[PDB]
Amino acid sequence: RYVSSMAIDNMGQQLAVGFASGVISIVSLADLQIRLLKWHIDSVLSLSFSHDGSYLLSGGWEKV
Amino acid sequence: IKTKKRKTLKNLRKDSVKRGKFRVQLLSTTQDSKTLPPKKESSIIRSKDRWLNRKALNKG
Amino acid sequence: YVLTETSAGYALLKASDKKIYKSSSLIQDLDSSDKVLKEFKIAAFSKFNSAANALEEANSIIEGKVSSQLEKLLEEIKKDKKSTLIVSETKLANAINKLGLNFNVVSDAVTLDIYRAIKEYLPELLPGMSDNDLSKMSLGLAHSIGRHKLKF
Amino acid sequence: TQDSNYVRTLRQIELKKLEKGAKQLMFKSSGNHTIFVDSREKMNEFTPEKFFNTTSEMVNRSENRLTK
Amino acid sequence: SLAKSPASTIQILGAEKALFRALKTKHDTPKYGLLYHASLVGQATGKNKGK
Amino acid sequence: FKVAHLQNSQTNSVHGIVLLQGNNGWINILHSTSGLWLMGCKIEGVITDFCIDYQPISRGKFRTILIAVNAYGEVWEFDLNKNGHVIRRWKDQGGVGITKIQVGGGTTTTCPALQISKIKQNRWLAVGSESGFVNLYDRNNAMTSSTPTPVAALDQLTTTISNLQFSPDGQILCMASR
Amino acid sequence: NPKAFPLADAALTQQILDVVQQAANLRQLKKGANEATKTLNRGISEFIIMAADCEPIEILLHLPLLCEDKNVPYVFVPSRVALGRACGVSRPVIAASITTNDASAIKTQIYAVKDKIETLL
Amino acid sequence: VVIEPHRHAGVYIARGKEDLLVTKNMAPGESVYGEKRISVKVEYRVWNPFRSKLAAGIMGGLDELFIAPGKKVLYLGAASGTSVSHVSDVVGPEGVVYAVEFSHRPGRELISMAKKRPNIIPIIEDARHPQKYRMLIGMVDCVFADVAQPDQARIIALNSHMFLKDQGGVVISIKANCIDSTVDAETVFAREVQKLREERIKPLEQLTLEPYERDHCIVVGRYMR
Amino acid sequence: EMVIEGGKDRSIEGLCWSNVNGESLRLFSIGGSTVVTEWDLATGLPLRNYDCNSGVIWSISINDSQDKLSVGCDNGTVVLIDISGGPGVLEHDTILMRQEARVLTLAWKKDDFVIGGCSDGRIRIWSAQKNDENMGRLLHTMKVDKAKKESTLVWSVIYLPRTDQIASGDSTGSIKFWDFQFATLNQSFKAHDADVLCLTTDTDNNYVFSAGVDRKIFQFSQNTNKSQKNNRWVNSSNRLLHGNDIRAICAYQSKGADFLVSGGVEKTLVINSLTSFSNGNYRKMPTVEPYSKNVLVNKEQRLVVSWSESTVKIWTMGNYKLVCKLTLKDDQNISTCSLSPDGQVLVVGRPSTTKVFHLQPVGNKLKVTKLDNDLLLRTSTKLVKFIDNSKIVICSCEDDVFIVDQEVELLEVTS
């Protein structure tokens, strides 16, 4: 439940909450429905969206 | 008696023996044909479960 | 206490039963007839028996191949109207003339057995006709309806 | 093309001779005949001349068995 | 039985003895048959009445 | 591959797409500067060729359509300025081994528009086949029929059509066989 | 046309016309209705392809009547134009008979397509 | 040159230069379909086990063929006179065959041979609706089936429950491919005789008629009730 | 509530309900055979074994408005069965246009079209709309992305009525959504690691749940207004709840009930919430809840009998020792059983017959002998409960209550 990153796209439709457990969650801001993205096996340290908002860059403790 | 018990069991259970050019089949019973659905075709059931336990998905 | 509608051409036959309507539409297993049981249970009530006229024959043939509300069935509804009696139709798709006006109709799963009986012994007691005459009128109707449907 | 026509009509002659020669022969049947019976003793027994009626002449060729 | 025959047969349909002698020795087959007496073939003149 | 223009349709920002013809029925569309996979369009059959049509909408907005042909002759048109979704699916009249589709008369990928207001709708569409037959459709009326008939089927060269290109004015088509 | 029984769908008609194209390259088909009926008479046809696109279809539906006598498979495809393209001529082709062979390179493809045909009879 | 009789009168074996099977005539003088005619003063038409299907069952040996010269028979699948001609020959002028078919393309020659023989009466309606020819005839003594449709057991079950008297005969010819291909004839024929004894048809015999037809059988049964 | 047992070498692969409004529930089921089997829910027996007229049935589906029934068979056929004739009576309707490969899953669009995924990696679309020109012929064919090193089978196909799509899971693990008109793919997800055996949806098609042999349940969502106006499913969530497989999944959603139910090779059932799948909780049922028992003991001789499928076994306490067993193979299916107090006679009983066996303890073994009674051999038994050492009471499957070794008056219930 600790959150170490967050990001928003250029429309404010979606929002990326990256947690210290490793997961990311895209919430859809109009209705607060979430989507979980689990790859990071350690804490999520950085998130960004692309300009159209359809790609999410993430980076963490793995150097990937 | 140990090496032919399944032989005498199957040779007394099974039907439709030969008579020269002919073959004398038993007709079945309305008892079984109305108490149960017929048996599965083991060919297709083996095909489906052998597919779901193919080697390419590493089960364990 | 019931009638049954049986056809052989344009000649329709509303034959009444020698038992009750419930007895007709309830048991049907007591005939098993050689000839005498069907002869006793049979009663030639009405015979709207037309002739070898191709118009009347093919008209009742089309009404037999379709729903059975023909003028001969209206004649049967005229000649059986006593107390809105019970009728045994042959085909279940003749539901209109089965229950159109004051006739409790029933055709299900033993009506076929009693039609097997009365169709087995149509010629022996119902008309004053013979076996070669029934086969000749049947083949005349058959060739008429065949050349009607199959064009020439 | 005309000697191909010659060989083709010779082939069609033999084709028609073949079909309307084999139409007027009779071939010995070979079919798996099967008979359905009651409980087990009718199957255990010999099918006792149920359609052979001689076990010497009119049993084992079926193009015409007989009933004397 | 005439309808299920090819158009070449309908061409040579009358000339069977000339056809089959000209096939059973390797000669040239006829081209007219029973259809020679049609009015169109009457209007044609030369080798184009075979055509 | 083919290179084309695409509009964002919430900004008036265009960017180039490359379009790759893949194995199953797939066209993989991806960005021409970043290489990011944008979308993919799958047709049903053996994908053989595809072309890009554009149509203007308003001042400064146009729409990109991918036109992809089965080997058998059935053609999909995908609107891809939105998500790559089918808007039309029709069938080439005749034509059984289909090698090459092309549009022309407006801005193709080979007559490209230098300025966004100079983007034109293509008039002609030629579907050239393995027998050398080239059906020619006139898209000023053959966008509505869904079994449209060609304005002519050319048959002059007899082996497999491997190039067919429209002149930039859209008055000559060039059939060519390798 | 209603009276053109079995008509092929798109996948079956695509592989039918593919085997027609490779039989045309191997010179193993007789294109045209009269040549198809000649192969039907002589019994050297593997299967018959017809086109449900001719404006009298009764110029076709007579070779079904002697296909069902020699139990040779027959099938309909929707386009005479496309059948002519597949047969590799410049004209529309109404019917085409793939002739028989036993040393043929495309024998397996012919057999596969004719089994897919006689499934729908 | 010597005609011997068969197990069923109206069926004979003309022995001699060609020991081949044969029936009588009810057509005086002529053949119908170019079958060979043998005279021995008396006219005879050769049956073919390949051209027809019941002749193959006779040649394979059908003991109680309920088609017999003192009956009337219902033929659900001829499409043309090539078998019901011989069935009218064997049933003679005492009885009647009801040749009932659906596809009216060879129904033309069906009605054409029914013109010549009064034994044969045709019905040109599909055999899954017997109620459409309720009003034509009933109570047959033996049904014959030659339909190559998938619902053979249901079609002849409906026809035998409407038109077959008790303890009569049922002869059904079963093609294996019209039900299920890719599986062998033994399983599909066992499946169909069980499907037919689900109704009141006690199966008597089946045979496979292998030199005449690929993957066929003829099943006879008696209609219980 | 009830259990309907089948016997030796019987399985069941698909089953569908049918409830025309105003008439009784009807339950059809295919096994691994050529028949469909319709069961009457009262007795717990088949009331109809309709042999479908083509090949071995691989899948079954029920029409929307439930008057027709699709069975998709091993020889590539799709057979329509007319259901609306009343409960029990089933007619053949139409064999749809054939194909080569076996059709492994079916669905209906409406009363009109029927979609079928086959074992050649393709998805056919037939029209079952009667009185059209193209009735029965297959209108479309679609092909999924094949596996590189093995054959691909499309295992699950559903229709999504709120949009106009077909969702399909195949044996690569990929899940594809296809526009029905234009018959073509909208988007493909590479979700599972192995086959997707079963997938389902909710009422308004805001979610599609899917599961297979890699034992995760994936959820694909379209609930956002932008998702609904753009027709764009997202791969929303993913849960690992099952132990071995998931072979069946279904969903129910009402005013006081919204759960998806799933089960697989591990024998237990799992309930999750539909609109709260990833967030909410779940319940893994016990693998057996013995509402019908298979074990009972007798206090004399300290012994216990227990019956699995078509065999009974008896052991005593001491440790413990297996004293006798009865693998009666004249039987095919078992049901309930009871022993006499004093441990003399066992009676086993199934819905077709029952049989009574005298027992004599001969030491470290028993001797068991059949005692013949043809009334017992003819009667259907559900429960036998032993009034005395000789008298038992029998509840028949057709609601009869006998007293043997005769008839209890039993009043009727308001229907």
The full DSSP string for chain F is -EEEEEE-SSSS-EEEEEEEE-SSSEEEEEETTT--EEEEEE-SS---EEEEEEEEEETTEEEEEEEEE-SSSEEEEEE-SSSSEEEEEEE-SS-SSEEEEEEESS--SSS--SSGGG-----EEEEEETTS-EEEEETTTTTS-SSPPPSEEE-SS-S---EEEE-TTSS-EEEE--
In which residue are the tokens 């591959």 written? F1
Exposure string (b/e) for H171-186, b if CB count within 10 Å is 16 or more?
bbbbbbbbbbbebebe
CA distance F76 to A40: 40
**I188 contacts I173 by C-beta, under 8 angstroms:** no
- Residue I131 sits at the chain G interface (C-beta within 8 Å): no
Helix (H, G, I), strand (E, B) or coil at C17: strand
User: Hey, which bits of chain A come out as E strands?
Assistant: 3-8, 14-19, 23-28, 33-38, 44-49, 56-60
Nearest to I188 by CA among I123, I122, I233: I233
Subunits adjacent to chain A (3 or more Cβ pairs under 8 Å): F, I
Identify whether the C-beta of residue H65 lies closer than 8 Å to the C-beta of residue H143.
Answer: no
The token pair at I230 is 């753009």
Q: Which 3 state secondary structure label does DSSP give I246?
A: coil
Q: Which two tokens stand for residue I326?
A: 């009865």
Chain C closest-CA separation from residue H121 CA (Å):
6
Q: Edge-to-edge strand order for the sheet containing I35-40?
A: I14-18, I26-30, I35-40, I45-51
| Three-state DSSP class for residue I238 | strand
Q: Torsion over CA of F113, F118, F122 and F128, rounded to 10 degrees?
A: -10
Q: How far, in whole angstroms, is CA D8 from its chain's centroid?
A: 33
Q: Considering only CA atoms, give the Rg of chain A.
A: 11
Task: With beta carbons less than 8 A apart as the criterion, state whether H201 and H173 touch.
Answer: no
Helix (H, G, I), strand (E, B) or coil at I74: coil
Q: How far is CA G46 from the centre of its chain?
A: 9
Contact between B54 and I150 under an 8 Å Cβ cutoff? The reply is: yes
> In degrees rounded to 5, what are phi and psi of residue H87?
-70, -35
Running DSSP on this structure, what letter comes out for residue C91? -
H159 contacts chain D (CB < 8 A): no
Residue D47 touches chain B, beta carbons under 8 Å: yes
List all chains that touch chain I, counting a touch as 3 or more CB pairs closer than 8 Å: A, B, F, G, H
> What contacts I374, CB < 8 A, 6 or more positions away?
none
d(CA B15, CA D44): 9
CATH of the domain at G34: 3.30.1330.30
Please, is G55 exposed, middle or buried when counting C-beta atoms within 10 Å of its C-beta (0-12, 13-18, 19+)? exposed
Segment holding D7, helix H or strand E = helix D2-22
Residue F94: its chain G contacts at CB < 8 A?
A: 79, 81-82, 84-85
> F146 in the Ramachandran plot: left (φ > 0), alpha (ψ -120 to 50) or beta?
left
Amino acid occupying residue A32: L
Q: The tokens of A36 are what?
A: 């979980």
Distance CA I26, CA I5 (A): 17
Q: Assess contact for I224 and A31: CB atoms under 8 A.
A: yes
- Hey, is the C-beta of F78 within 8 angstroms of any chain I C-beta? no
Tally of domains within chain G? 1
Can you tell me the distance from the alpha carbon of D45 to that of D34, in angstroms, rounded to the nearest whole number? 15
Q: Hey, is the C-beta of E29 within 8 angstroms of any chain D C-beta?
A: yes
Query: From the CB of residue I93, how many other CB atoms can be counted at a distance below 10 Å?
Result: 19
Contacts of G42 in chain D (CB under 8 A): 8, 11-12, 15
- At position G8, the amino acid (one-letter code) is A
| Pairwise CA distance, residues G97 & H130, whole Å | 40
Scanning every residue of chain F, which has its alpha carbon at the shortest distance from the alpha carbon of G53? Answer: F94
How many CB atoms within 10 Å of residue D19?
Answer: 10
A33 sits in the region (left: phi over 0; alpha: psi -120 to 50; else beta) called: beta
Three-class SS of residue I377?
helix
The values of phi and psi at residue I357, to 5°, are -125, 120
**Cβ–Cβ gap F42/I182 under 8 Å:** no
Q: b/e per residue, B39-55, with b = 16+ CB within 10 A?
A: bbbeebbeebeebbeee
SS3 assignment, position I257: strand
Place of tokens 């090698």: F99
Give contacts of A50 with chain F, Cβ < 8 Å: 36
Q: For chain E, which chains pass the contact test of at least 3 CB pairs under 8 Å?
A: D, G
- How would DSSP label each residue in I258-274? EEEEEE-SSS-EEEEES
Answer for the pair F40, F97: CB distance below 8 angstroms, yes or no.
Answer: no
- The sign of the CA dihedral H125, H131, H132, H137 is positive
Q: In angstroms, rounded to a whole number, what is the distance separating the alpha carbons of residues C77 and C46?
A: 11
Asked whether the beta carbons of residue B42 and residue I37 sit closer than 8 angstroms, the reply is no
Domain residue limits at G74? 1-121
* CB atoms B20 and D59 under 8 Å: yes
Lookup result for tokens 């005769």: I406
Strands H140-145 and H73-75: parallel
**Burial of H156 (C-beta count, 10 Å sphere; 0-12/13-18/19+):** buried
Contact G95, G36 (CB under 8 A): yes
DSSP for I125-146, please give it. EEE--TTSTTSSSEEEEEE---
d(CA F119, CA G79): 37
Q: Which of G10, G11, G119 minimises the CB distance to I76?
A: G119
Which sign, positive or negative, has the C-alpha torsion H53, H19, H71, H196?
A: negative
Structure tokens at I129: 């709309």
Tell me, yes or no, whether chains F and C touch by having 3 or more C-beta pairs under 8 A.
no
Query: Smallest Cα–Cα separation from H34: which of H98, H109, H103, H121?
Result: H109
3-state SS of chain H is: CEEEECCCCCEEEEECCCCEEEECCCCCCCCCCCCCEEECCCEEEECCCCCCCHHHHHHHCCCCCCCCCCCCEEECCCCCHHHHHHHHHHHHHHCCEEEECCCCCCHHHHHHHHHHCCCEEEECCCCCCHHHHCCCCCCEEEEEECCCCCCHHHHHHHHHHHHEEEEEEEEEEEECCCCCCCCCHHHHHHHHHHHHHCCCEEEEEEECCCCCCCCEEEEEEEECC
Kindly list the residues from chain A whose CB atom is less than 8 angstroms away from the CB atom of residue I226: 13, 28, 30
| Separation CA H44–CA H25 (nearest Å) | 6
- Cβ-defined contact of H165 to C141 (cutoff 8 Å): no
Experimentally determined by = cryo-EM
F112, F120 Cβ separation under 8 angstroms = no
Window 4-23 of E, Cβ < 8 Å to G: 4-8
Whole-number Å distance between alpha carbons of I386 and I336: 13
| H98-102: long-range contacts, CB 8 A cutoff, minimum separation 24 | H98/H72, H98/H73, H98/H74, H98/H122, H98/H123, H98/H136, H98/H137, H98/H140, H99/H75, H99/H123, H100/H74, H100/H75, H100/H76, H100/H124, H100/H125, H100/H127, H100/H133, H101/H76, H101/H77, H101/H127, H102/H126, H102/H127
8 Å CB contact of F94 and G17:
no
Alpha helical stretches, state H, B1-60: 5-13, 30-35, 42-52
Contact H20 D26 (CB under 8 A): yes
Cβ neighbours around I213 below 10 Å, total: 25
Burial I44-76 (b: 16+ CB within 10 A, else e): bbbbbbbbbbbbbbbbbbbbeebebbbbbbbbb
Tell me how many degrees the CA angle H73-H75-H80 measures, rounded to the nearest 5.
130
Asked if G9 lies within 8 A of I138 by C-beta distance, the reply is yes
Measure the CA–CA gap between H136 and H138, rounded to whole angstroms.
Answer: 7
CA angle H106, H108, H111 (to 5 degrees): 115
Q: Give which of C91, C131, C147 to mutate to test H binding, by max H Cβ within 10 Å.
A: C91
Alpha-carbon span I321 to H224, nearest angstrom? 54
Q: Do I139 and G7 touch (CB under 8 A)?
A: no
Which chain D residues contact residue G43 at CB under 8 A?
Answer: 15
The rounded radius of gyration (Å) of the Cα atoms in chain B is 19
Residues forming a β-bridge with I170: I154
Instruction: Provide DSSP, G70-85.
Output: TT--EEEES-HHHHHH
Q: Contact, C2 vs C86, CB < 8 A?
A: yes
Phi and psi at H151, nearest 5°, equal -95, 55
Question: Least CB-CB distance to G9: which of I76, I133, I141?
Answer: I141
For H106, the token pair is 């060879």
D36 touches chain B (CB under 8 A): yes
- Can you tell me the distance from the alpha carbon of F174 to that of F68, in angstroms, rounded to the nearest whole number? 20
